[PDB]
Design a protein around this ligand. Structure first.
Ligand SMILES: Cc1cn([C@H]2C[C@H](O)[C@@H](COP(=O)(O)O)O2)c(=O)[nH]c1=O
Ligand SMILES: Cc1cn([C@H]2C[C@H](O)[C@@H](COP(=O)(O)O)O2)c(=O)[nH]c1=O
Lengths: 257, 257
């Protein structure tokens, strides 16, 4: 018996960040996360403003933002609050717990001070989560664990995926879901976000592999599609975002029955 | 048949950045990499200058450097040239090929412009290496693949480690070695760098596990020790670096018989 996003937002064990996300997904009829893989602050803010109404989440990539400052982040947060979407930073936390804590809080980027969500690879073992949560829990943040990857030759399969699920379900005070290609947890409190999404079949020239919104949401049971080039390379980015939103949303409704 | 670092520098298939490293290791009698996990440029540069003569490599951590600028990295290059050590940036590239390319070249940090070596996780598949290579190849950079991890619960074991070795073998134009706990390749062109090293037994409270220089160089067959807190937390970091250098160097000499 599958629950709607709005009902999942109310589950007793839901994490506050997941609840906030699920409520705005339901309100706005969007389960699309825009991957904003851009080099300029002006492009990031322009896309966030123009596409904000169509998205539940914006995945930032601050490591490639040539003119990052914390003032840009302040402005991005203003747009996120106005249009109602969460900010998910791309950075791949993937080190021992002692140093990921410093990477999350510190440096020039101060990721924990503006990202609602971050993601981590599980390869270090659960210390990666324990280190992140020492920063994320005081800042009321959530984390996604990379349980599967979309690229050719991915090693995030089999027992590796199972380890990611166990690590999430044992750190539910901080971990709110997964980056995955499919549903991997049977617990409805966890979110599933799927990159490697385009309307048409294909890939890229460096190992990316694409599946459609209907396949990943409808057949594979994921919750949210993450789309970069399928939107940003389109002539009309607003229309492209709307096409992806409508595709992902219908696929969700049809699985819901 | 074990070869000295100086002889390995002359191997037919050696990459130019590995040859440079192996030659300075032999010249200076050091197989120590300092893990400069500090948040201030002045401390980084003071450590690089004082410990430069004792190290073959300095592992930077720019994501935690609160006052990073490219001018700081210019001064680090000057010290690296003066004292003869390589610069290895910590950032754990762990994305699809198309995005890691941009992360390596771009943003504020412009890692490829100053780092001799970078490291990647192999979980995405070989596209991670191909994307980095598209930037680093003409710059005579090299990459290290994370084949094993030192932390409790590491998933970099078994077939995962074997996949890392195969990926390195198959990309030897750019991959010059491993982050590992032991020798994982039989090919002497490859470097093995081992973190999780301290003179004393123990660990940390976030899953780090330590082994001694004698164990990891002498018994486990690795080439270089990566040492952070064992040096950084000492009152006199120069004396500590010298203790680690002598331990790792004499363990290496023991192998040669
Ligand atoms: C963990 C993970 C991230 N991503 C990231 C890389 C890009 O920032 C984004 C996909 O962008 P794209 O839609 O332009 O291919 O998602 C994957 O594509 N696959 C994965 O498995
Ligand atoms: C890939 C990898 C990196 N590292 C990094 C994290 C730190 O920057 C450094 C170890 O620092 P430490 O000597 O203070 O524990 O090396 C590991 O400790 N283990 C690993 O397996």
């Amino acid at each position: 018996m599958e629950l709607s996003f709005g009902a999942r937002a109310e589950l007793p064990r839901i994490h506050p960040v997941a609840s906030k996300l699920l409520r705005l997904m339901q309100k706005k009829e969007t389960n699309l996360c825009l991957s904003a893989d851009v080099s300029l602050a002006r492009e990031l803010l322009q896309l966030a403003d123009a596409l904000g109404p169509s998205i539940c989440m914006l995945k930032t990539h601050v490591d490639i933002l040539n003119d990052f400052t914390l003032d840009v982040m302040k402005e991005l947060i203003t747009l996120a609050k106005c249009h109602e979407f969460l900010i998910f930073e791309d950075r791949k936390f993937a080190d021992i717990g002692n140093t990921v804590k410093k990477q999350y809080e510190g440096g020039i980027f101060k990721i924990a001070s503006w990202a609602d969500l971050v993601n981590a690879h599980v390869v270090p073992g659960s210390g990666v989560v324990k280190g992140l949560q020492e920063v994320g829990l005081p800042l009321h943040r959530g984390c996604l664990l990379i349980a599967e990857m979309s690229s050719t030759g991915s090693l995030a399969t089999g027992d590796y995926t199972r380890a990611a699920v166990r690590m999430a379900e044992e750190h539910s005070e901080f971990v709110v879901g997964f980056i995955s290609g499919s549903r991997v947890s049977m617990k409805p409190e966890f979110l599933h976000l799927t990159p490697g999404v385009q309307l048409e079949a294909g890939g890229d020239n460096l190992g990316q592999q694409y599946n459609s919104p209907q396949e990943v949401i409808g057949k594979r049971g994921s919750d949210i599609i993450i789309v970069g080039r399928g939107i940003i390379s389109a002539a009309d980015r607003l229309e492209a975002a709307e096409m992806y939103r409508k595709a992902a949303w219908e696929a969700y409704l049809s699985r819901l029955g």
